Design a protein around this ligand. Structure first.
Ligand SMILES: CCCCCCCO[C@H]1O[C@H](CO)C[C@H](O)[C@@H]1O
Length: 158
């Protein structure tokens, strides 16, 4: 089991960390969602589906910078929605394919009432997402840590 980003940065068997750079809607109004769809940027696969089934959770999702300060968040994982920042580990998603498959994570971030102006700064860390991978074969319990950075400013009109 291993993962990679759309620009080809890989985290190998055993886990590790990688940076993910996301383009963001430049203008988001109070009452609208900023959507960070990581399923287009983060992909994983099973290296031995002939024999092994891999299990994948969102162990934890943390908010930083302007997302922490200025937004109210929800994370959708494989069709279900949870608070973001997270309060518990999600159920498992099964990976039984050697072909790259999206990590089905998306953030829905809506500005808090006090938000206004530059709510997210280009280059800033906005989230850390922890992918936890186990299997039905041995005792592997690996973390794939995804550091999410904004590619651009996000302005909340006032
Ligand atoms: C003849 C025995 C060959 C054993 C190969 C084990 C490969 O393990 C890796 O791939 C696994 C499947 O995705 C998940 C693991 O957790 C490792 O990621």
């Amino acid at each position: 089991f291993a993962c990679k980003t759309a620009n080809g940065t890989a985290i190998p068997i055993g886990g590790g960390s990688a940076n993910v750079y996301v383009n963001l809607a430049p203008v988001v109004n109070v009452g609208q969602n900023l959507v960070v769809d990581l399923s287009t940027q983060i992909f994983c696969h099973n290296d031995y589906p002939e024999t092994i089934t891999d299990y994948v959770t969102l162990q934890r999702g943390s908010a930083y910078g302007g997302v922490l300060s200025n937004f109210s968040g929800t994370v959708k994982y494989s069709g279900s929605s949870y608070p973001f920042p997270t309060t518990s580990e999600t159920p498992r998603v099964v990976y039984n394919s050697r072909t790259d498959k999206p990590w089905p994570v998306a953030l829905y971030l809506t500005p808090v009432s006090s938000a206004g102006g530059v709510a997210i700064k280009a280059g800033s860390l906005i989230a850390v997402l922890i992918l936890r991978q186990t299997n039905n074969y041995n005792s592997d319990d690996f973390q794939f840590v995804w550091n999410i950075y904004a590619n651009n400013d996000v302005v909340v009109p006032t």
